[PDB]
Design a binder for this molecule. Structure first.
Ligand SMILES: CC(C)(CO)[C@@H](O)C(=O)NCCc1nc2cccc(O)c2[nH]1
Ligand SMILES: CC(C)(CO)[C@@H](O)C(=O)NCCc1nc2cccc(O)c2[nH]1
Ligand SMILES: CC(C)(CO)[C@@H](O)C(=O)NCCc1nc2cccc(O)c2[nH]1
Ligand SMILES: CC(C)(CO)[C@@H](O)C(=O)NCCc1nc2cccc(O)c2[nH]1
Ligand SMILES: CC(C)(CO)[C@@H](O)C(=O)NCCc1nc2cccc(O)c2[nH]1
Ligand SMILES: CC(C)(CO)[C@@H](O)C(=O)NCCc1nc2cccc(O)c2[nH]1
Lengths: 157, 160, 160, 157, 160, 157
C-alpha cells in the first residue's frame, strides 16, 4: 500500500515529521511529495526543500522524498499511490483540505484523501509561523530538525 | 495485515456510514464496523437490531466484520488488535469534537492511530439524528438509507 | 406574490426574531411566522401562548401571519404554498447546523429556497435559550424581549 | 424586486451559475455585478469577466451582467437594488460575509444582505481552486460553463 | 487590588482548570474559584464534594478562595466585588458560546470584564465531560486529574 | 502590573480603542505596541501609525504607544510586561491567535496571552475592511478616531 504525503514543506517542521512518522506506521511505503508551489513564493527552492526533507527523514526506512510541479492527482496516479495524507490542524486548514480532497476525488476517484492528527506538541505550529519567529531572530530549535534549523538561519543571515 | 475499527452508534446505519466503511475496505485488509451500545444516547434501535441491519447492509463487502461492544471503544480496539481507528468527517462541528476524541483515544491506546475519511458530497450533510427526526415527522428519508434500514425504520415508526 | 415561511420554536419570541421577521416583510409580500410545537425540546411556553405572544409582538407588521404547526416543517411549508424559507444566522454554530437543515429541506421540498438573513449587531449574541436561562436565574432580560413577552415571562417564572 | 449578486467572478463558475439561477427564482430582476477588484490582482480583466458572465447567463431571462469599480453600497443604491445575495460556502467565507453585510448595513440600511446555499455539487469549489487545477493542466470542464473553460485555457496556454 | 472570579461547574475539577486558575493567580491579586450548583446539568459530584475537591487541589495557591454559588453568575460576581471574569478557552466550540455568554454578562454587569486565558497544550483537548465518560467506561484518566480528584472519582464509580 | 496590546494598527480603529480602553480598566499600565510588520506591506509607515495611535489614545492616562521591529516575546520581556492582550473577533483570528499565544509561551513562559472581547458595535470591523471602504470613497467616520479618518483620506487622495 502506497501513500503520498504532499505539501509545500517550506521548510519541513517537526509537525511534518510527526505526520510522516505516523503515516509509515500505517502504510508500507510513504512518498513525502514536495510541490514546487511558485504561487506561494516559497523561501526555499524546490531542490533545497527536497534536500532538507531527505536529510530530515533519512532515519525513516520507508519514506521517499520527491519534488513535483504536476497536478497532485496526476502525480499520485504516477506514483501508484491510492492514499493521500494531510495533517489536521485548524478549521481554516480543514475546510481548505475538504475542497482539495473533493477536487482530487473528481480527478482521481480511487485516490483516498485521509487526515492524521499531529501530536499536541506540534498542534499550533506551521512553516509560516516558524519563518516569522526566525525572521525576528527568535529561537526555533524546538520546532525543526537540526539540518532545517541550520538552513533557515543561513537563508536569513 | 492491518486491522481497522470503524466505531459508532449506527442508530441506524446510513448511506453516509456505508460510504465511509466502503472507503475503509479499499485501504485496509480487515475492517471491524463496531457498534456501541451507547445507552446514554437512548437509541431508537436496540444493539441487536443495529448489528443485524449493519450486517445485511455491508454483506457485499468481503473484509467487513460487524460487532457490538459496550466497553470503552479504546478497550475494545485493543482487544481486537486494531491499530487504525476510522472516523468519518463531514464538517467543522465533527472536526472539534473529533480532535478531543482522537487525543483522548491516543492517551488511552497510543498504538491506535485515528484516521479521518471524507464521505461523498452526497452524504456530507446527513446524520443518523437528522434522518431519525425527519422520518419521525413524516418526511421522506429513503434516499439516505440502505433498503433494509428503510424497511426497518418504517416498521419501527408504524408502531411507536 | 412570493410567500415566505419563518419557522422556529419561538420559546419565547425575542427582539432577535422580531428583527429577522421585520427584515423578511421588507423583502417578501407575505411572511408566515410558523411556530413549531417542538415537544422533544420541552418548551417553557405552550404552543398557544407562543402563538399569542408572537401575534401581539408582530401586530404592527401588516404582511405577517402567525401560525402554529406540529408537522414536518417542509410538509407545512408545502401546504402553505411557501417557496422561501427564512433562517436567521448569528454565528458559526448556527451556520453548520443550518447547512444540514437547508440541504435536508431541499431534498424534501426542492421548490422551497432557504434564504439566510442577519439580525442587527444588537441581537447577534442572543438566543431564546440564553434569555430563558438568565431570567430563570434572576437576571434582567427586559432589553431582549418585546414588552408583552417580558410580562408573560415574569408571570411564568413567578409561579414555576 | 431588484437583487444584486456581487463578486469578483474571476472567472464565473458553475457554483456562481447555481446561486444566480436560485436568485432569479426568488426575485424579479437580478443584477450579477462584477467588482473590478484590482487589489485581488484578477486573472481576467473586468471586460473579459463581464463578457464571460454575459455569455454564461444568456439563457436566464432576468439576469443583467454589469461591471463596477464603485463602493458596493453605492452601486446597489444606484441599481435600485434592496437585496444583496451571496452564496454561503465555508466558515471563512461566512465570517468575512458577516463583516461586509454589517458594513453595507451601516452605509445603506435598507439594503438587505442575504445568503443562498449552493447545491452539494458546487459546495467545495471556488474560482481560486479551479484556476489552481487549470494552472496544472487538470480537467476543469465539469466546474465551468463551456465559454469560461475555453477562455481559461486560452489565458493559460 | 483586582478581584477576579473563575466560575464553572468543576464537575470534577481537572488539571485543565488547575492550569487556568494558576495562570489567573499570576495576573490578579485575588481569585475566587466559584463553583455553580448547576442542577440542570445533573452533576456527578454534589456542590459540597466539588468545593472540597477544589479547595484541596488549589490549597498551594495562596490567593485562591473556593466558593459555591446557586445564583446567576453575574449576581454572585457583583456581590463579591469582582471586576474580572476568567474564562478558559481551548477551541472553536468554546469561543462561540463564550462570546454569547460574555456579551450577556456584559449586559448584566458592565463593570465585569470577561478575560479569556489559554490552558497548556497538555490540557487543550480535555473537558470534565470527556474525563467522566472515559472513567465511567473504565478508561484511565489519572493523567488529567489532581490526585484527590482521581481518588474521589474512583470511589464514586466503585459504588454507582 | 504591565500589559502589552500588540498589533499592526494600520490604522488604529475604534475597535482597537475599545480593547485598549478595556485593558486600562484592568491593568495599571498598558503599552500599545505597533509592530513594523513589513511583510504585511502596511499602508502607513511605522512612524505614522505610532503618531496616529498616540493622538487617538492621548485621552487615556495609562496608555504608552511604542513602535517595534523586534520579536514580540523579546519586546514584551524588555517592556517588563507579563500580560499580552488581543481582541477576540472571529474564528480565523482566534485560531491564529492560539498559534501566536502558544509560540509566545514557548519563548517567554511567564508572558500570559489573554483575550478581551470588543463591544458588539466594533465586532465586525477591521483595519483591512475600513481601508477597503475608504479606497472606494465610502464613509468610515463612524469607525475611526477623527485624526485617523483625516490621515486615511490624506493618504488616499
Ligand atoms: C501542495 C498542496 C497539497 C498544498 O495544499 C496543493 O497546493 C497542491 O496539490 N499543489 C500541486 C498542484 C495542484 N493543486 C491542486 C489543487 C486541487 C487538486 C489538485 O490535484 C491539485 N494539484
Ligand atoms: C460511539 C463513539 C465511537 C462515537 O463518538 C464514541 O462516543 C465511543 O467511543 N463510544 C464508546 C464508549 C467510549 N467513550 C469514549 C470517549 C473517549 C475515548 C473512548 O475510547 C471512548 N469510548
Ligand atoms: C423548529 C425548526 C424550524 C428550527 O431548526 C426545525 O427544527 C423544524 O423544522 N422543526 C419542525 C419539524 C422538522 N424537523 C425537521 C428537520 C429537517 C427538515 C424539516 O422540514 C424538519 N421539520
Ligand atoms: C466583490 C465583493 C462583494 C467580494 O466580497 C467586495 O470585495 C466588494 O464589495 N467590492 C467592491 C468595493 C467595496 N468593498 C466593500 C467592502 C465593504 C462594503 C462595501 O460597500 C464595499 N465596496
Ligand atoms: C457554569 C458557567 C459559569 C459556565 O458556562 C455558566 O453557565 C453560569 O454562569 N452559570 C450560573 C448561572 C448563570 N447562567 C448564566 C448565563 C448567562 C449569564 C450569567 O451570569 C449566567 N449565570
Ligand atoms: C503584530 C502581531 C502581534 C500581529 O498578530 C504579530 O505579527 C507579531 O508579534 N509581530 C512581531 C514579530 C513577531 N512575530 C511573532 C510570531 C510569534 C511569536 C513572536 O514572539 C513573534 N514576533
Amino acid at each position: 500500500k502506497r501513500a503520498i504525503y504532499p505539501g509545500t514543506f517550506d521548510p519541513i517542521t517537526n509537525g511534518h515529521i510527526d505526520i510522516v512518522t505516523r503515516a509509515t506506521q500505517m502504510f508500507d511505503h510513504v512518498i513525502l511529495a514536495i510541490a514546487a508551489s511558485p504561487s506561494k513564493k516559497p523561501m526555499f527552492t524546490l531542490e533545497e526543500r527536497v534536500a532538507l526533507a531527505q536529510q530530515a527523514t533519512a532515519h525513516l526506512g520507508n519514506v521517499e522524498v520527491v519534488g513535483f510541479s504536476d497536478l497532485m492527482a496526476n502525480f499520485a496516479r504516477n506514483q501508484h499511490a491510492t492514499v493521500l495524507i494531510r495533517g489536521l490542524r485548524a478549521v481554516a486548514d480543514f475546510e481548505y483540505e475538504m475542497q482539495l480532497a473533493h477536487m482530487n476525488r473528481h480527478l482521481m476517484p480511487e485516490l483516498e484523501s485521509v487526515f492524521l492528527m499531529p501530536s499536541k506538541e506540534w498542534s499550533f505550529i506551521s512553516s509560516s509561523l516558524v519563518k516569522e519567529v526566525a525572521r525576528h531572530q527568535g529561537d526555533v530549535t524546538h520546532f525543526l530538525p537540526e539540518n532545517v534549523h541550520q538552513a533557515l538561519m543561513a537563508k536569513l543571515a
